[PDB]
Every structure is written in structure tokens, then in C-alpha cells.
Amino acid sequence: GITRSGSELITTLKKNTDTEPKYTTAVLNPSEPGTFNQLIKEAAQYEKYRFTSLRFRYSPMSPSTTGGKVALAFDRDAAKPPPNDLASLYNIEGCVSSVPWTGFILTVPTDSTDRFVADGISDPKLVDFGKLIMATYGQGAAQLGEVRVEYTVQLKNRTGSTSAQIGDFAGVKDGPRLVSWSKTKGTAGWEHDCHFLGTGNFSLTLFYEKAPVSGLENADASDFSVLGEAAAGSVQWAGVKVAERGQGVKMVTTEEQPKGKWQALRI
Amino acid sequence: KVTRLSAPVALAYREVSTQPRVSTARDGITRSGSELITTLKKNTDTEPKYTTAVLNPSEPGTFNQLIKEAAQYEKYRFTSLRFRYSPMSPSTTGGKVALAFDRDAAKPPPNDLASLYNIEGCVSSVPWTGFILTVPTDSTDRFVADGISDPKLVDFGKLIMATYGQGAAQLGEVRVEYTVQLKNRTGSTSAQIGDFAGVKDGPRLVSWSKTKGTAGWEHDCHFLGTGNFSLTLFYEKAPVSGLENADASDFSVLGEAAAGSVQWAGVKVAERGQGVKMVTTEEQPKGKWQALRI
Amino acid sequence: KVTRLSAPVALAYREVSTQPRVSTARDGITRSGSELITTLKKNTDTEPKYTTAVLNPSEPGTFNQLIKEAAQYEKYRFTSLRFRYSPMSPSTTGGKVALAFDRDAAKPPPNDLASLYNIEGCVSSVPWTGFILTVPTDSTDRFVADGISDPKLVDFGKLIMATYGQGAAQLGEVRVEYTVQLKNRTGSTSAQIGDFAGVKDGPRLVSWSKTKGTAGWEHDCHFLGTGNFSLTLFYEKAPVSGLENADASDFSVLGEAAAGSVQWAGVKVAERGQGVKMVTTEEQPKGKWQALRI
């Protein structure tokens, strides 16, 4: 084995001037960028880990003239519906929400079993502890604060590999059959779907034939870079910068599914 | 007290996650609190406004984690139980957050304060601070509700909480510090199944409600027990209505009407015997139902 | 042994009425036997004939008084358990009363003796005497059936009993001397409610059976757990049939057919996964049901 130590800043939160919290539950595993954009680059050479240190601080950068709460407590079982309701939240360890005008920390009893990261899929339970959570309920106005993850990991067994990703459609069917980060659904009335399952800035590159409707548009997205035609048989490219998990981008070509091909590298 | 005081802009607390503790045979088991009973919500108005919540080993609207170990017993205790206004909202907000229990856990809250401010409990404070509440608990082997009954011989009394203010916020939260005694070994429950057979009915497997009808068919769908429930049930000629309610707590119907369908609701009662009803003709035969407590 | 022996005309015993005993938290409770598992009935024939009865904390056909305190736990023990042939029938009658358990509590009894007389247990004797039976019990935290499963990973194995004779009588009776360990605090059960919604179904509240169908509508009504149960359920277009059964134990149907009715049955299974079925058309939508273990 090798090791590490934290320094990440896992997404924020945003007002809530409402009477029911509202959660951003973020998942924890050596490779889940939506929780590690700087360490998901050294787990492409190993498989298994540790944790020995990891805590989340509500940095505190917003005056007191604002208030409410900012729940923040982890639940091993990093996967299952957040509740819907507080008490529900306020009953699951973690413990610790405080107001937004102060500086709090959060800590987690970490174990000691040689768990494996996801070069997929699996089951969200045998591969990673559990997701994190964060709610905040208030009404007085502000852009609360930010947090990270204080940690120290153990990456046993020397491996090495990974990426995102080339995924072609075959007139009858498709083809994602070589590491993901996006799911490509379509919404009928052809207008389509071009998605994510992972989080970070990417380098798209791809797909083609009948350069129709459009292409490479985007919606719940981060920066876009398209240097293509349209193509009616062309080539294309873009750089995303996402937001929280699952942000989407899309084309526009007819009616019913066959096309060409693509490849999505993470970067 | 004297001189110096710091009413901070902000004050706040940090509560955790109560993990539970328990005893031999002697003729009983036990417990300890950790629940968080609903909140409150502003009140930027000049008259309080109450959420009165009922107390009994099985009334989820006051225990979502202990109403799962009273399906094997019947009778209890209390030895410890207090409610804290956790305090998670700055001082730039204010008013009051009344909070005092009344044995007689069932009867109209008043309408007015003084009325409230005259019934022990005592203790409201402002929303920017952390307060606690405590209750003189007795010592009689009382029974939980595998129904219905009477809201008085089966459970101490409901709790209350008001808050009157106008400066803006989502005040705080509370729970129930407790330690119970669950004698007599029993075991059973859920949401009770009771079918009507065209000639007659059928409640013949543990209660909490009595189903009377008032002629001019408009009907009756009742309780003998007290707490939050999970209804689930009954059907055939989906008539008139169904699942309406009157002296009731929250209702949840996710059915048709049905003229042959299926249905569901969650109650949150008030004091003993609150009622809900259908509407289907004239003279009694129907279908079936099952009422689990929860 | 030697010389003298008195095979009395009559011998008989006098058993009472076992009142029960129990332990802290540590992570478990306990028990002790006193049940009387079905008898046997003549056999004035030359090939035994078996009543094989299955063993698991919840399989009433082997526990009618303890299948009421496993609706709050899941896992067990055994530390003590033996079956006695009480002896209440004169010697003017005779034959044998085989009686020996086989861990692998599920598999066809044979057909033949030697077959039986080759599987431990050991111990049959004549009907005019008082015998006992005992079992080497293990030590693995096994789970009871809130269903179905597999009859092997959830319970040791069924018991057996044969008797072959011809001289006339109503032999005797037996029970199960035991002491159990019920770890992990759970709590729930009954007979599981699982509805089909025209588009889909609904098993979404604790199992013991999987409901598959075999095309050519003739259908499927199954198990994942093992013991005697209390069915109760489902309905609308009372077609084909209903509640038939095949790899099953005793059936009790007190329904119509129904074309919109109501129904009920008591199973007594065999080893894991035995099946029962209806008969209604072609392609899946129906009504609803609930399967309590008992």
C-alpha cells in the first residue's frame, strides 16, 4: 500500500428560504468524483481502501444577518432515499447542523475492512461506506457556505487502468460497453438526450452520419465546447464542467434512434 | 443573574444520534428516548397556534422508532421523558415557542394563550435559545392502543407546542427524552383485518375502531385507540365516497373511489375515538378492510 | 438385563403442562419446549407410513406456542429438543413407531423402512412403552422464514414418524423438548400483503412466496419460506379456479371461486418452495392478497 489525506470541496448549498429541508446527498468512494476530483486520478492503479481520516467542515463564509440550519451527517449505508423529513434526518447520526453564520466540523467513525472501489457497478453497499448528506432550512437570505472532506486513505493491491469511453449505436441497438459516465436517453418527439453518471470537466469528442437537428446543445451544464459542423455525416467535440451529478446535453436527429458513434473520455 | 448578558446573533446547538439501551424478565423489558416529533413553522401572527401531538407507546405521530416493539407487549411506564427545543435559528428572529404537556393528553387546545399559559408544562421561551421540558411521570400499568378505546385510560395525554412571533424563520426542532416499561409479553399488530359479510360483518382479529353507520346512508368509520396509523383497505361498489374524514388527523387517500377498487390513508389522531367515513348505499353489505396501528 | 421382565397389559404415563422460562440483552433472549406435534393413527399394514413434520422457529405444524415470539426476531439456536412418545395405549396393541430427525429437514421420506431404518434418529420402539428421542444440535446463527427461501439454509430439517402395526389402537402422542436462542431484535409479521396493479404487481412488504405464472394461463402461487401458514386473500374475476395446490401440505379454502370474491387456506409445507395456484386469464391483472406466516 501507498496513502493520502483530504482537501476537496464537495458542492454547496443554496438558500432554502422554505420549512422542510432539502438534501444534496453526495456519495463516498475513492472514485465517485461528485466527491473527489483530486484523488480519482490515483485509483486507476489500485483497488481497495481504507479511510483513517475524513471530516467535513462548514466553512463558514456568510454573515449572521442570515440564519436557519445546515444539517450535515454521514450514514455508512451511503445509499438509500434521504428521507423526506427532518426528524428522519435528525435521527441519523452525523449530528451536526448548526446555523450558517458559524464554523462547524463533522466527523465519521471509519472502519477497517479492505473494501473495493467501482470499476463499475456493483451494489451501492459492498463497494463504498455510504453517501454523505447536507440540508439546510432557512429563509433569511444568503449563499450560506462551503465544505470539503478531511481524509487519509489506503489504496492496497497494485492494479492500474480505467477512463470513462467509446459507445456506438447499431441501427437495431446501441453499444456503452466500455466504461461509463453518461446514459443516453431520449425523450420522444425527437429532441433527445445526452447525459452523465459521473462528475468533473470532460473532453468529448465524437459521434455522426445524418447531421440533422442539431447537436450539441446543452441544458444542466457546464461550459460546452463544440467545434463541429452539424455534420450530416460529420465530426464533433465539447468540454463539459459539470455540476452535480447527472447534468445533460443533446442532439437533435430523427425520430427513431439509429445514427453513428461516440467516445466520452473523462479528463 | 446580573450585569452581563450576551444575546448573541447566533446561538446554536449540536445534537447527535442517540444509539438505544435495555433489562432481565422480572416481568418487563425498557427503553430510552430519541425521537424528533414535527416543527413548527413561523407564526408571524398575534395568537399562538398549536400542533398538539399525542403520547402513547404506539401513536407514531410521536414515536416512529419504538412503535415497533409494542407489538409484542401491552402496558407501560415512562420514567424519563422531556422535550428540548433544540435551538437552530439565529436571534435576528424572535417570539415564543410554548411547549408544555397536559396529562389529559386529549381535549381541545384552547384557542387562547392565557389558556395555554395556565396549563403547567411551563415553558416557552424564545426561538434563539435552547430550552428543555420535563413531565412528572406516574406509576400505573397503563395499556397501549391495539385500538381505540377512550383517549384517557390508555395514554397520559398529548403534548402541545405553540409559537407566536413575526420576525422571520424556521424556528427549531424537538424530541422526547424517555425510558419506558413494557410489561406483559404479548405480540402482534400491523395497520387488524375486519370484513363485512352481506348478512353481517367480521372485527374478529384485534381492534382499534368501531364501524357504525348513521342512517341516511352517510356512514361511520371509527377509533377506540389513539396514535398515527396506516390504513389500508376495503372495496367493491365504489360509491359515494370514501374516505372522507371529520374529527381527524392528517388523511391519506390514494384510492379511486373504486366501484370495485382499493384504498389507503394515514390518520394522526386526536383524542380517542376521532372518526372517518365512506359513502355507499343504503344498507350495509360491501367488501373488507384491515387497520394496522403503526 | 436379564431374567425378568414385565410387559404389562398396560403401561401408561402422566405428563403435565409445561409452564415456560427466559435471559438479559447480550444480544438475545431464549426458550424451552412443550408442544405436542400430531399423532399418529394405526397402520394395521406392512409398510410404514410417515407424517414428516418440519422444524423451524416458525412452522406451526411444529410450534403453535412460540411462533408468536419470532415476529420480533430473526435467527436461532436450539440447545435442547427431544421428542417423546408419550406412551398412552395398552400392550394388547403393537408394531413400531419410528421417530428420528434428519438435519436436512426436507427431502422425500423414503418410501421404505430400511431407508428409514438407515437414517439416524434411531428410535422406534413399540407403541405400549414410553420412549424419547434426541438430536445433536448445532451452533450456527440460522434465520427463520419471513418466507421462503430454500428448505435448507433456513431450518435444520423436518422430523419424521412412522408406525407399522396391525393390532388395534390410537397409539400415542409426542412433543418437542427444546431451548432456543432468538438473536437480533426485529419485529413484524402475520399471514405479508402483495397486490397486483393491472400494469404490475406489488410484494413490497415482507415475503415468503414468489408468484410466477406459467403461460397457458394456469398459473403459479409459491413459497420461499417453510412452516404451517394462514392464507388469507386476493380477488375480482373469480375464474378458473383457485386455490388449487400441488407440492403442498394441507389446504384450506373457504372461498367462492369469487368472480369478485374472498378466500383463505392453511398450508403445511414441505421443503421449501412447495407451490399453490389459481386459474384466471391470460394475462396477469387481478386483485390482491396477504400472506401471514403463522
PDB file of N, CA and C in Angstrom, chain A residues 151-212:
ATOM      1  N   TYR A 151      -9.461  13.739   5.046  1.00  0.00           N
ATOM      2  CA  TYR A 151      -9.256  12.293   4.941  1.00  0.00           C
ATOM      3  C   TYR A 151      -7.792  11.893   4.746  1.00  0.00           C
ATOM      4  N   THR A 152      -7.651  10.581   4.851  1.00  0.00           N
ATOM      5  CA  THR A 152      -6.393   9.832   4.722  1.00  0.00           C
ATOM      6  C   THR A 152      -6.767   8.394   4.332  1.00  0.00           C
ATOM      7  N   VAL A 153      -6.370   8.014   3.128  1.00  0.00           N
ATOM      8  CA  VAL A 153      -6.752   6.710   2.555  1.00  0.00           C
ATOM      9  C   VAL A 153      -5.594   5.712   2.453  1.00  0.00           C
ATOM     10  N   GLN A 154      -6.039   4.493   2.185  1.00  0.00           N
ATOM     11  CA  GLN A 154      -5.201   3.302   1.990  1.00  0.00           C
ATOM     12  C   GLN A 154      -5.661   2.608   0.703  1.00  0.00           C
ATOM     13  N   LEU A 155      -4.778   2.607  -0.269  1.00  0.00           N
ATOM     14  CA  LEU A 155      -5.058   2.021  -1.588  1.00  0.00           C
ATOM     15  C   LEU A 155      -4.205   0.752  -1.816  1.00  0.00           C
ATOM     16  N   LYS A 156      -4.625  -0.414  -1.262  1.00  0.00           N
ATOM     17  CA  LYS A 156      -3.814  -1.663  -1.470  1.00  0.00           C
ATOM     18  C   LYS A 156      -3.906  -2.156  -2.892  1.00  0.00           C
ATOM     19  N   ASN A 157      -3.296  -3.310  -3.020  1.00  0.00           N
ATOM     20  CA  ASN A 157      -3.206  -4.065  -4.262  1.00  0.00           C
ATOM     21  C   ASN A 157      -2.907  -3.153  -5.439  1.00  0.00           C
ATOM     22  N   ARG A 158      -1.784  -3.440  -6.050  1.00  0.00           N
ATOM     23  CA  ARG A 158      -1.332  -2.723  -7.239  1.00  0.00           C
ATOM     24  C   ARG A 158      -2.104  -3.240  -8.459  1.00  0.00           C
ATOM     25  N   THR A 159      -2.858  -2.330  -9.060  1.00  0.00           N
ATOM     26  CA  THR A 159      -3.627  -2.599 -10.294  1.00  0.00           C
ATOM     27  C   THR A 159      -3.152  -1.607 -11.369  1.00  0.00           C
ATOM     28  N   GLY A 160      -4.094  -0.857 -11.939  1.00  0.00           N
ATOM     29  CA  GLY A 160      -3.766   0.188 -12.945  1.00  0.00           C
ATOM     30  C   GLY A 160      -4.604   0.052 -14.234  1.00  0.00           C
ATOM     31  N   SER A 161      -5.409   1.088 -14.487  1.00  0.00           N
ATOM     32  CA  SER A 161      -6.291   1.155 -15.684  1.00  0.00           C
ATOM     33  C   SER A 161      -7.468   2.113 -15.437  1.00  0.00           C
ATOM     34  N   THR A 162      -8.345   2.173 -16.440  1.00  0.00           N
ATOM     35  CA  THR A 162      -9.596   2.956 -16.364  1.00  0.00           C
ATOM     36  C   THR A 162      -9.631   4.158 -17.330  1.00  0.00           C
ATOM     37  N   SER A 163     -10.772   4.846 -17.239  1.00  0.00           N
ATOM     38  CA  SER A 163     -11.104   6.059 -18.026  1.00  0.00           C
ATOM     39  C   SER A 163     -12.596   6.382 -17.873  1.00  0.00           C
ATOM     40  N   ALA A 164     -13.381   6.596 -18.974  1.00  0.00           N
ATOM     41  CA  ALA A 164     -14.837   6.777 -18.905  1.00  0.00           C
ATOM     42  C   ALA A 164     -15.725   5.579 -19.249  1.00  0.00           C
ATOM     43  N   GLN A 165     -13.956   6.187 -22.930  1.00  0.00           N
ATOM     44  CA  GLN A 165     -15.272   5.563 -23.132  1.00  0.00           C
ATOM     45  C   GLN A 165     -15.801   5.830 -24.548  1.00  0.00           C
ATOM     46  N   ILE A 166     -15.974   4.730 -25.256  1.00  0.00           N
ATOM     47  CA  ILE A 166     -16.473   4.698 -26.642  1.00  0.00           C
ATOM     48  C   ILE A 166     -17.796   3.911 -26.632  1.00  0.00           C
ATOM     49  N   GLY A 167     -18.869   4.504 -27.160  1.00  0.00           N
ATOM     50  CA  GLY A 167     -20.207   3.837 -27.119  1.00  0.00           C
ATOM     51  C   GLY A 167     -21.051   4.106 -28.375  1.00  0.00           C
ATOM     52  N   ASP A 168     -21.063   3.109 -29.241  1.00  0.00           N
ATOM     53  CA  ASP A 168     -21.733   3.180 -30.554  1.00  0.00           C
ATOM     54  C   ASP A 168     -23.162   2.611 -30.565  1.00  0.00           C
ATOM     55  N   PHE A 169     -23.995   3.220 -31.402  1.00  0.00           N
ATOM     56  CA  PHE A 169     -25.362   2.719 -31.666  1.00  0.00           C
ATOM     57  C   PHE A 169     -25.326   1.925 -32.996  1.00  0.00           C
ATOM     58  N   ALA A 170     -25.847   0.726 -32.939  1.00  0.00           N
ATOM     59  CA  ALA A 170     -26.027  -0.128 -34.121  1.00  0.00           C
ATOM     60  C   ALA A 170     -27.516  -0.152 -34.565  1.00  0.00           C
ATOM     61  N   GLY A 171     -27.888   0.714 -35.482  1.00  0.00           N
ATOM     62  CA  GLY A 171     -29.258   0.778 -36.111  1.00  0.00           C
ATOM     63  C   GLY A 171     -30.383  -0.020 -35.379  1.00  0.00           C
ATOM     64  N   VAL A 172     -30.040  -1.188 -34.864  1.00  0.00           N
ATOM     65  CA  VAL A 172     -31.000  -2.053 -34.141  1.00  0.00           C
ATOM     66  C   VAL A 172     -30.948  -1.728 -32.650  1.00  0.00           C
ATOM     67  N   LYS A 173     -29.761  -1.439 -32.244  1.00  0.00           N
ATOM     68  CA  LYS A 173     -29.382  -1.216 -30.840  1.00  0.00           C
ATOM     69  C   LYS A 173     -28.186  -0.268 -30.775  1.00  0.00           C
ATOM     70  N   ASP A 174     -27.691  -0.117 -29.577  1.00  0.00           N
ATOM     71  CA  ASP A 174     -26.537   0.732 -29.297  1.00  0.00           C
ATOM     72  C   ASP A 174     -25.288  -0.116 -29.080  1.00  0.00           C
ATOM     73  N   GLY A 175     -24.636   0.181 -27.990  1.00  0.00           N
ATOM     74  CA  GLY A 175     -23.261  -0.278 -27.707  1.00  0.00           C
ATOM     75  C   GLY A 175     -22.568   0.795 -26.713  1.00  0.00           C
ATOM     76  N   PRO A 176     -22.654   0.658 -24.754  1.00  0.00           N
ATOM     77  CA  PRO A 176     -21.856   1.506 -23.889  1.00  0.00           C
ATOM     78  C   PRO A 176     -20.798   0.670 -23.266  1.00  0.00           C
ATOM     79  N   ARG A 177     -20.466  -0.223 -23.912  1.00  0.00           N
ATOM     80  CA  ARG A 177     -19.909  -1.488 -23.420  1.00  0.00           C
ATOM     81  C   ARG A 177     -18.410  -1.352 -23.136  1.00  0.00           C
ATOM     82  N   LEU A 178     -17.988  -0.173 -22.685  1.00  0.00           N
ATOM     83  CA  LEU A 178     -16.557   0.038 -22.374  1.00  0.00           C
ATOM     84  C   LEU A 178     -16.312   1.292 -21.492  1.00  0.00           C
ATOM     85  N   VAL A 179     -16.825   1.262 -20.237  1.00  0.00           N
ATOM     86  CA  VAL A 179     -16.671   2.164 -19.077  1.00  0.00           C
ATOM     87  C   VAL A 179     -17.474   3.462 -19.282  1.00  0.00           C
ATOM     88  N   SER A 180     -18.295   3.782 -18.273  1.00  0.00           N
ATOM     89  CA  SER A 180     -19.212   4.958 -18.304  1.00  0.00           C
ATOM     90  C   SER A 180     -18.798   6.219 -17.469  1.00  0.00           C
ATOM     91  N   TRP A 181     -19.735   7.282 -18.376  1.00  0.00           N
ATOM     92  CA  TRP A 181     -20.061   8.253 -17.323  1.00  0.00           C
ATOM     93  C   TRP A 181     -21.445   8.861 -17.554  1.00  0.00           C
ATOM     94  N   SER A 182     -21.972   8.600 -18.736  1.00  0.00           N
ATOM     95  CA  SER A 182     -23.273   9.147 -19.148  1.00  0.00           C
ATOM     96  C   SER A 182     -24.204   8.056 -19.691  1.00  0.00           C
ATOM     97  N   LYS A 183     -25.493   8.306 -19.501  1.00  0.00           N
ATOM     98  CA  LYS A 183     -26.570   7.459 -20.051  1.00  0.00           C
ATOM     99  C   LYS A 183     -27.299   8.280 -21.095  1.00  0.00           C
ATOM    100  N   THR A 184     -27.472   7.679 -22.238  1.00  0.00           N
ATOM    101  CA  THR A 184     -28.097   8.364 -23.359  1.00  0.00           C
ATOM    102  C   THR A 184     -29.539   7.919 -23.565  1.00  0.00           C
ATOM    103  N   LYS A 185     -30.423   8.694 -22.953  1.00  0.00           N
ATOM    104  CA  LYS A 185     -31.860   8.527 -23.154  1.00  0.00           C
ATOM    105  C   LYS A 185     -32.321   9.580 -24.110  1.00  0.00           C
ATOM    106  N   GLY A 186     -33.473   9.318 -24.598  1.00  0.00           N
ATOM    107  CA  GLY A 186     -34.146  10.212 -25.483  1.00  0.00           C
ATOM    108  C   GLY A 186     -35.545  10.390 -24.962  1.00  0.00           C
ATOM    109  N   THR A 187     -35.997  11.514 -25.154  1.00  0.00           N
ATOM    110  CA  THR A 187     -37.404  11.891 -24.970  1.00  0.00           C
ATOM    111  C   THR A 187     -38.044  12.086 -26.338  1.00  0.00           C
ATOM    112  N   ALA A 188     -39.154  11.215 -26.456  1.00  0.00           N
ATOM    113  CA  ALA A 188     -39.894  11.129 -27.722  1.00  0.00           C
ATOM    114  C   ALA A 188     -40.283  12.518 -28.175  1.00  0.00           C
ATOM    115  N   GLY A 189     -40.510  12.614 -29.451  1.00  0.00           N
ATOM    116  CA  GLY A 189     -40.672  13.914 -30.070  1.00  0.00           C
ATOM    117  C   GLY A 189     -39.254  14.303 -30.192  1.00  0.00           C
ATOM    118  N   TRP A 190     -38.851  13.630 -31.347  1.00  0.00           N
ATOM    119  CA  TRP A 190     -37.412  13.561 -31.195  1.00  0.00           C
ATOM    120  C   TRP A 190     -36.847  15.016 -31.125  1.00  0.00           C
ATOM    121  N   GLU A 191     -36.191  15.043 -30.051  1.00  0.00           N
ATOM    122  CA  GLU A 191     -35.489  16.014 -29.242  1.00  0.00           C
ATOM    123  C   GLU A 191     -34.867  14.885 -28.512  1.00  0.00           C
ATOM    124  N   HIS A 192     -33.737  14.975 -27.942  1.00  0.00           N
ATOM    125  CA  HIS A 192     -33.158  13.711 -27.466  1.00  0.00           C
ATOM    126  C   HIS A 192     -32.566  13.859 -26.077  1.00  0.00           C
ATOM    127  N   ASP A 193     -31.582  13.026 -25.806  1.00  0.00           N
ATOM    128  CA  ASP A 193     -30.888  13.031 -24.509  1.00  0.00           C
ATOM    129  C   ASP A 193     -29.413  12.661 -24.689  1.00  0.00           C
ATOM    130  N   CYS A 194     -28.575  13.508 -24.078  1.00  0.00           N
ATOM    131  CA  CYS A 194     -27.150  13.199 -23.966  1.00  0.00           C
ATOM    132  C   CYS A 194     -26.576  13.560 -22.557  1.00  0.00           C
ATOM    133  N   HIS A 195     -26.444  12.450 -21.712  1.00  0.00           N
ATOM    134  CA  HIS A 195     -26.152  12.518 -20.223  1.00  0.00           C
ATOM    135  C   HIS A 195     -24.770  11.934 -19.810  1.00  0.00           C
ATOM    136  N   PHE A 196     -24.897  12.176 -18.091  1.00  0.00           N
ATOM    137  CA  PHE A 196     -23.837  11.873 -17.124  1.00  0.00           C
ATOM    138  C   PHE A 196     -24.330  11.057 -15.909  1.00  0.00           C
ATOM    139  N   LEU A 197     -23.341  10.330 -15.397  1.00  0.00           N
ATOM    140  CA  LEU A 197     -23.428   9.421 -14.238  1.00  0.00           C
ATOM    141  C   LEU A 197     -22.241   9.710 -13.306  1.00  0.00           C
ATOM    142  N   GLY A 198     -21.331  10.496 -13.871  1.00  0.00           N
ATOM    143  CA  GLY A 198     -20.087  10.931 -13.206  1.00  0.00           C
ATOM    144  C   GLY A 198     -20.044  12.467 -13.146  1.00  0.00           C
ATOM    145  N   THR A 199     -19.041  12.979 -12.434  1.00  0.00           N
ATOM    146  CA  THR A 199     -18.870  14.445 -12.227  1.00  0.00           C
ATOM    147  C   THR A 199     -17.361  14.881 -12.368  1.00  0.00           C
ATOM    148  N   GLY A 200     -17.167  16.054 -13.076  1.00  0.00           N
ATOM    149  CA  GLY A 200     -15.823  16.733 -13.373  1.00  0.00           C
ATOM    150  C   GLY A 200     -15.854  17.502 -14.765  1.00  0.00           C
ATOM    151  N   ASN A 201     -14.709  18.118 -15.216  1.00  0.00           N
ATOM    152  CA  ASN A 201     -14.597  18.774 -16.598  1.00  0.00           C
ATOM    153  C   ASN A 201     -14.193  17.668 -17.588  1.00  0.00           C
ATOM    154  N   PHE A 202     -14.810  17.599 -18.789  1.00  0.00           N
ATOM    155  CA  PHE A 202     -14.546  16.443 -19.660  1.00  0.00           C
ATOM    156  C   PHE A 202     -14.108  16.902 -21.046  1.00  0.00           C
ATOM    157  N   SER A 203     -13.776  15.916 -21.843  1.00  0.00           N
ATOM    158  CA  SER A 203     -13.382  16.125 -23.231  1.00  0.00           C
ATOM    159  C   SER A 203     -14.102  15.136 -24.091  1.00  0.00           C
ATOM    160  N   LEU A 204     -15.128  15.691 -24.654  1.00  0.00           N
ATOM    161  CA  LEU A 204     -15.956  14.968 -25.528  1.00  0.00           C
ATOM    162  C   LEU A 204     -15.366  14.978 -26.811  1.00  0.00           C
ATOM    163  N   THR A 205     -15.716  14.213 -27.228  1.00  0.00           N
ATOM    164  CA  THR A 205     -15.213  14.020 -28.593  1.00  0.00           C
ATOM    165  C   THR A 205     -16.092  12.992 -29.298  1.00  0.00           C
ATOM    166  N   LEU A 206     -16.695  13.348 -30.462  1.00  0.00           N
ATOM    167  CA  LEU A 206     -17.500  12.288 -31.102  1.00  0.00           C
ATOM    168  C   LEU A 206     -18.732  12.548 -32.022  1.00  0.00           C
ATOM    169  N   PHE A 207     -19.170  11.134 -32.327  1.00  0.00           N
ATOM    170  CA  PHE A 207     -20.371  10.529 -32.966  1.00  0.00           C
ATOM    171  C   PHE A 207     -20.643  11.225 -34.290  1.00  0.00           C
ATOM    172  N   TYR A 208     -21.936  10.674 -35.260  1.00  0.00           N
ATOM    173  CA  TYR A 208     -22.004  11.304 -36.589  1.00  0.00           C
ATOM    174  C   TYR A 208     -22.897  10.441 -37.547  1.00  0.00           C
ATOM    175  N   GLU A 209     -23.037  11.008 -38.765  1.00  0.00           N
ATOM    176  CA  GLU A 209     -23.707  10.488 -40.038  1.00  0.00           C
ATOM    177  C   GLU A 209     -24.689  11.542 -40.652  1.00  0.00           C
ATOM    178  N   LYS A 210     -26.001  11.429 -40.360  1.00  0.00           N
ATOM    179  CA  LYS A 210     -27.047  12.401 -40.833  1.00  0.00           C
ATOM    180  C   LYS A 210     -27.100  13.575 -39.817  1.00  0.00           C
ATOM    181  N   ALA A 211     -26.250  14.594 -40.114  1.00  0.00           N
ATOM    182  CA  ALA A 211     -26.083  15.825 -39.284  1.00  0.00           C
ATOM    183  C   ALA A 211     -27.339  16.666 -39.345  1.00  0.00           C
ATOM    184  N   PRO A 212     -28.216  16.306 -38.442  1.00  0.00           N
ATOM    185  CA  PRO A 212     -29.534  16.865 -38.511  1.00  0.00           C
ATOM    186  C   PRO A 212     -29.636  18.152 -37.795  1.00  0.00           C
TER     187      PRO A 212
END
